[PDB]
Amino acid sequence: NVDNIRVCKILGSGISSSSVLHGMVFKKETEGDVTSVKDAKIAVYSCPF
Amino acid sequence: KVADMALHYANKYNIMLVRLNSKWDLRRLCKTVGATALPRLTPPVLEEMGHCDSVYLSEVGDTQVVVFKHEKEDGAISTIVLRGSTDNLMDDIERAVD
Amino acid sequence: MMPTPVILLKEGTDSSQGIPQLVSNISACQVIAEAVRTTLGPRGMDKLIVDGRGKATISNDGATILKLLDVVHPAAKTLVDIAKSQDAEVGDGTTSVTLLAAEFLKQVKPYVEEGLHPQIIIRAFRTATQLAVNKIKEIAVTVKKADKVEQRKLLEKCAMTALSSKLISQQKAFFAKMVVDAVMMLDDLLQLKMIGIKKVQGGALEDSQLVAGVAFKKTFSYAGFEMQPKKYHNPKIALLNVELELKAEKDNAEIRVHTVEDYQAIVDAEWNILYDKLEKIHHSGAKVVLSKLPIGDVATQYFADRDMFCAGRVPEEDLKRTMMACGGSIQTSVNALSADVLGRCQVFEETQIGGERYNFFTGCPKAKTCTFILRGGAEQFMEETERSLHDAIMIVRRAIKNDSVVAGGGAIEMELSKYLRDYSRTIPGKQQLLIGAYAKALEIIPRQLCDNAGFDATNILNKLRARHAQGGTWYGVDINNEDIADNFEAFVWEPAMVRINALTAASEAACLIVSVDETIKNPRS
Amino acid sequence: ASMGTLAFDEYGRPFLIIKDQDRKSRLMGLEALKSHIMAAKAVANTMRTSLGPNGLDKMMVDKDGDVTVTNDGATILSMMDVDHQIAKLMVELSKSQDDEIGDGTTGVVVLAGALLEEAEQLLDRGIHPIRIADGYEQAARVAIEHLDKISDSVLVDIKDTEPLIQTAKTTLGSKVVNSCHRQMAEIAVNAVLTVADMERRDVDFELIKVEGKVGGRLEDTKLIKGVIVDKDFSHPQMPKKVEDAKIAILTCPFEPPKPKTKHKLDVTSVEDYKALQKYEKEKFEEMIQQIKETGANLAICQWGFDDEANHLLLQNNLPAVRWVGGPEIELIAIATGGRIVPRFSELTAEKLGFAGLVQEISFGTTKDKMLVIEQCKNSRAVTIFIRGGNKMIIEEAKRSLHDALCVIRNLIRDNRVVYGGGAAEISCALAVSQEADKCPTLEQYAMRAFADALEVIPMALSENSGMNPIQTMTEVRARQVKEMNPALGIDCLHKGTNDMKQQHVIETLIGKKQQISLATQMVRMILKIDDIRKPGESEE
Ligand SMILES: Nc1ncnc2c1ncn2[C@@H]1O[C@H](COP(=O)(O)OP(=O)(O)O)[C@@H](O)[C@H]1O
Numbered sequence A: 001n002v003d004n005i006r007v008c009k010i011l012g013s014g015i016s017s018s019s020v021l022h023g024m025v026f027k028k029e030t031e032g033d034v035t036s037v038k039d040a041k042i043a044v045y046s047c048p049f
Numbered sequence B: 001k002v003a004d005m006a007l008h009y010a011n012k013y014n015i016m017l018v019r020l021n022s023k024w025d026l027r028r029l030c031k032t033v034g035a036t037a038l039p040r041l042t043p044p045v046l047e048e049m050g051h052c053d054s055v056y057l058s059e060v061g062d063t064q065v066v067v068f069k070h071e072k073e074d075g076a077i078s079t080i081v082l083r084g085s086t087d088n089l090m091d092d093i094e095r096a097v098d
Numbered sequence C: 001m002m003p004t005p006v007i008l009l010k011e012g013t014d015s016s017q018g019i020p021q022l023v024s025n026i027s028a029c030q031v032i033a034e035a036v037r038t039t040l041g042p043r044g045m046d047k048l049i050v051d052g053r054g055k056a057t058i059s060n061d062g063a064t065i066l067k068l069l070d071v072v073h074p075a076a077k078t079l080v081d082i083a084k085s086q087d088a089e090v091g092d093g094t095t096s097v098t099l100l101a102a103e104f105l106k107q108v109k110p111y112v113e114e115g116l117h118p119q120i121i122i123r124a125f126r127t128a129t130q131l132a133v134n135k136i137k138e139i140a141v142t143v144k145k146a147d148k149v150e151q152r153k154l155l156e157k158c159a160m161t162a163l164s165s166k167l168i169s170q171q172k173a174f175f176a177k178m179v180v181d182a183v184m185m186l187d188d189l190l191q192l193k194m195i196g197i198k199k200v201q202g203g204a205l206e207d208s209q210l211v212a213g214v215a216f217k218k219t220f221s222y223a224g225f226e227m228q229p230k231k232y233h234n235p236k237i238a239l240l241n242v243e244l245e246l247k248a249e250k251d252n253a254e255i256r257v258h259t260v261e262d263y264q265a266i267v268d269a270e271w272n273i274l275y276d277k278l279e280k281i282h283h284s285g286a287k288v289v290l291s292k293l294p295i296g297d298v299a300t301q302y303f304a305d306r307d308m309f310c311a312g313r314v315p316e317e318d319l320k321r322t323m324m325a326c327g328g329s330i331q332t333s334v335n336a337l338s339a340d341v342l343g344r345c346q347v348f349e350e351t352q353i354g355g356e357r358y359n360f361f362t363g364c365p366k367a368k369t370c371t372f373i374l375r376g377g378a379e380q381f382m383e384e385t386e387r388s389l390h391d392a393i394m395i396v397r398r399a400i401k402n403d404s405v406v407a408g409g410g411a412i413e414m415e416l417s418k419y420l421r422d423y424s425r426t427i428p429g430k431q432q433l434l435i436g437a438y439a440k441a442l443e444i445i446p447r448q449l450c451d452n453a454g455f456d457a458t459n460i461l462n463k464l465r466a467r468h469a470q471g472g473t474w475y476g477v478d479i480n481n482e483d484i485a486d487n488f489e490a491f492v493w494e495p496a497m498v499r500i501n502a503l504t505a506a507s508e509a510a511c512l513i514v515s516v517d518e519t520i521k522n523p524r525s
Numbered sequence D: 001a002s003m004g005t006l007a008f009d010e011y012g013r014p015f016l017i018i019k020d021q022d023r024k025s026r027l028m029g030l031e032a033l034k035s036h037i038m039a040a041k042a043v044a045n046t047m048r049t050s051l052g053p054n055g056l057d058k059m060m061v062d063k064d065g066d067v068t069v070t071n072d073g074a075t076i077l078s079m080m081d082v083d084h085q086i087a088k089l090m091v092e093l094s095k096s097q098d099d100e101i102g103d104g105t106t107g108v109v110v111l112a113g114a115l116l117e118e119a120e121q122l123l124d125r126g127i128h129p130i131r132i133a134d135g136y137e138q139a140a141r142v143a144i145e146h147l148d149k150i151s152d153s154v155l156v157d158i159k160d161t162e163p164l165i166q167t168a169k170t171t172l173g174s175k176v177v178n179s180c181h182r183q184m185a186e187i188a189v190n191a192v193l194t195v196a197d198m199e200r201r202d203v204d205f206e207l208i209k210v211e212g213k214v215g216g217r218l219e220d221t222k223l224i225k226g227v228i229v230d231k232d233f234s235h236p237q238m239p240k241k242v243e244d245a246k247i248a249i250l251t252c253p254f255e256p257p258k259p260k261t262k263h264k265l266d267v268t269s270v271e272d273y274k275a276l277q278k279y280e281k282e283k284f285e286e287m288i289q290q291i292k293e294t295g296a297n298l299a300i301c302q303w304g305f306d307d308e309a310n311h312l313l314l315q316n317n318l319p320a321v322r323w324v325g326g327p328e329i330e331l332i333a334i335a336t337g338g339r340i341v342p343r344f345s346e347l348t349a350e351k352l353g354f355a356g357l358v359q360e361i362s363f364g365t366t367k368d369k370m371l372v373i374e375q376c377k378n379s380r381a382v383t384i385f386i387r388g389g390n391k392m393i394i395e396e397a398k399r400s401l402h403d404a405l406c407v408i409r410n411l412i413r414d415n416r417v418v419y420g421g422g423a424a425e426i427s428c429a430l431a432v433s434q435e436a437d438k439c440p441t442l443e444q445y446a447m448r449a450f451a452d453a454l455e456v457i458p459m460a461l462s463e464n465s466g467m468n469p470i471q472t473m474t475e476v477r478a479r480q481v482k483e484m485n486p487a488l489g490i491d492c493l494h495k496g497t498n499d500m501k502q503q504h505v506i507e508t509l510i511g512k513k514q515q516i517s518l519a520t521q522m523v524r525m526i527l528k529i530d531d532i533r534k535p536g537e538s539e540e
């Protein structure tokens, strides 16, 4: 599937510094206070919280 | 959206909140994590619960990003982080990647 | 040009191709560069730009000046883009990137004019840039002692060097000490939003202060506010996201009663709801109450009667900073106001600051934030002060990430130019000319420094070249002494990544501009 | 000398760099510095005539034709309709001096103009503007240190207010209210001292109410240790004067209660109607009885009330005032010592404020009434009531009294003073000149220019008073050098002596320091700007 490859464009460090991440990157922030999880257990809801 | 009471109670129980605007991103995240997009606020069963090696907030350049990182060399969806000194240059590199 | 009955593209489409359009692009890049030339170095000047609305802006910052210019030339916008990129990634050197890119283009302009294939120029630029970046990484001075005093001195020197080009350069030592102290209190991410910057008009620059805590302006006090005490010696702070007002329970709530007793009961129930919230807050033991949401006059008078302090409509960023400084939690509900979710600071006080009232939270021992209070005689004075402090803060953050420094004042550019010339002397000769042009273009920085300072640039450049070839790595322009000096012992220090990113971005922009052979403009819609 | 450059390419193809570049304009190099210096000199020369006791006023007219006559430099520059950016910088400088100190807004503009005037010839002699700015900065440092050295401390205690009276008098000397000079000075001192936290803390200005009504005489301006209110008694037949009034401050309208939530009371039978009417009548009677039970004599409300409550208040010998503004409610509660009560159910005797006399005041053949609440026990709020022959002198008196209050506040913050009349500038210039004799040659020119620019204040004072500027300033400087007396200034009022310590001309030290600092910083900014890019489109 071609759409399974996502491209994130973050400006500044020259194209030689690009890398490949096994996952996804979203250009946004967390709503709450917790900002890092090491054993994530994501629960996804399509409805408003 | 995220309600204020819900956010406060999530902060009380040490739960990370991420709000995805586009349903396409929600579907892609569900694919790359292994979770099912529930339609209500019911607790998720063990099958519908998604898993990932690390979720964290980080800053690249001057933009804050949320990263869903897998340690394994596998996954339904993989992403390429393109850097560069110009928007047009990154767009051209994206065309080459395509 | 025979007029075809049906033309190919839309009428009014403009196309320019070949050597002339590339030469025009180089000239446009030169025009963009010369608009920021004089703002380089300790003798640099400021630019004033007035927009259509008549609101002027004054800045020494290259990225700000370029953004305020309404650049429409497609090739010239690349310089603005790389200036923005350098500002984003590093935060300092937004003038050096543009000067270097335009100098590269100017140096290779004669070769372009005589039909040289641009791919050769692009390859030569990439080779030279790779070599220069490797040289910067190799010769950058790093101290592997992990000494706190040494690290603090390194950060202070880097901040001073970053600041010694702005209108706050006279108090650069004072401001650099303040910036280093501010940055070192951030925990692990060094988020900019955790460093508040408040601009209060009136007062000297030396009146600027850094508070080890949080401070913000008084926010529309209601009646009965002046009856509250304005100083506490060990307050407990109740950070809240709650509207303490008499209002409808919900926007869609409707009350239906058919008895006057029920009418009175409903009125008393609304009053009892408000008083229950207020009583829970009061019995929490807190003395200072801050809310992200409005606090009504009834609640203000209630807190005044209890010798408490209240403040509503506090901005969200200020509340987050207060959280980080005091160590509580923003509560949307008051049903569980346990002692752990309550902030704590040694001294809270409301004071007069130059014609305005501010709330001061000081004495926070576990503080992870700070607030800058900048004093100045005009709005643009404080704005330029804020921009300069932002440059210093970014430099200090990057230096915290990695402590590798190279002497400034044109020393690093001179050394790189010497290295690149020595390399280019040992290659066939088609690439030799272009790499030599790159090395010559690297000399723009000390030349522009000398030009801005008013020296004779040629003699200083000759002395610098002789010193570098004879031996000596960190010899650069000495502005005060009209001469050259060892800029490493003069503590003209900048992080290596500043020059690394500058060279990388300038090379990428020059290659992108050179690679273009035709420009086509469609008619506007 | 505009629109940057114009090339249209060597090959003749179009060369468009900046949007609308053909209509924009720019100024580069020393020409920009000269234009900025010219604009600043024009502004400062306009302003310098309003400096000192003999300074003259400027009659300012706004868009709508309203006219204000004033001597305040900050007000003059705020109402001025300028377009030059450097003029706007001068306006911002004056406003900054007003905000931080409150006095000296005219001095900073003149000092900055003089500094830029000297920098003009320094630039023409071939000196980098940054060198001039650095020399100015170090000269200002020397001058501030000298000012700290030659300062004097004064007592800021209540028992002996004479130094405070003299300082306020010196502040008010240049204003039109000097016809009531000592009276205004004394009322300003008393107002500041009344509302002030003792331990050198701030003086909160919203505790000072400045109110002005036309008519009467300027000498009739008085200090009220209470509150003046634009309202009056609600019912025309309640007494106009209450003695030893026990105030009852309320924020609940004297109306039947109404829930905030959307509510509907259903009437389903005649019994429901009778019960509703009885409820209304009993609610009115109950609220009046609750007010009366505390023993109150006067009732102050914020949201007004209706006819039944008004007549019940009149019938029960309870004069009342309605629709009082929130700030006035707060001031009344603070002064009288009472507490603001949100509803009648919480009204108790301990929450009643006390006022010695509450009176309604007439103003001649005008039908307007205003309420006086004075003779409080320990009033922590004060009010200044200004009268005059027209609204222009009333506004000028308002701003002059504001200047006096600001000066006394600054004295509270720091009690060190220096003697004005140009003495401080002369001493600072002498110190700067002495230091320049030891400096290396290149910065010597900048320091000497700074000293000459400092010397402009005595020149302006002497010119405004009709004396010869150069001769008078030179004689005073020679006298200051020959005998060590930094208190010798320009005898503006021709009292026959040059010793300002004897003449009681007193200025706050922090005011002078702020003047010098702000002037130096703005001059540094203006010197540092070398490029202007105006749109130049001249739209409508
Ligand atoms: N004290 C100094 N002596 C010599 N050169 C300096 C000094 N301080 C800064 N510079 C040089 O001035 C150049 C420009 O710095 P600055 O104008 O502050 O930011 P930018 O790089 O964005 O123009 C830097 O390359 C630095 O090497």
Ligand SMILES: Nc1ncnc2c1ncn2[C@@H]1O[C@H](COP(=O)(O)OP(=O)(O)O)[C@@H](O)[C@H]1O
Pocket: D050, D051, D052, D053, D055, D073, D103, D104, D105, D106, D107, D170, D171, D172, D173, D174, D175, D420, D421, D422, D461, D489, D490, D491, D492, D493, D505, D507
């Ligand atoms: N009685 C006086 N004799 C001599 N000089 C005076 C006297 N009163 C005021 N001055 C001087 O006049 C100058 C102008 O004061 P004023 O116009 O009131 O405010 P500003 O400082 O804003 O101009 C002051 O610097 C002061 O030194």
Ligand SMILES: [Mg+2]
Pocket: C092, C093, C162, C163, C165, C391
């Ligand atoms: Mg810099």
Ligand SMILES: [Mg+2]
Pocket: D103, D104, D171, D174, D403
């Ligand atoms: Mg004055």
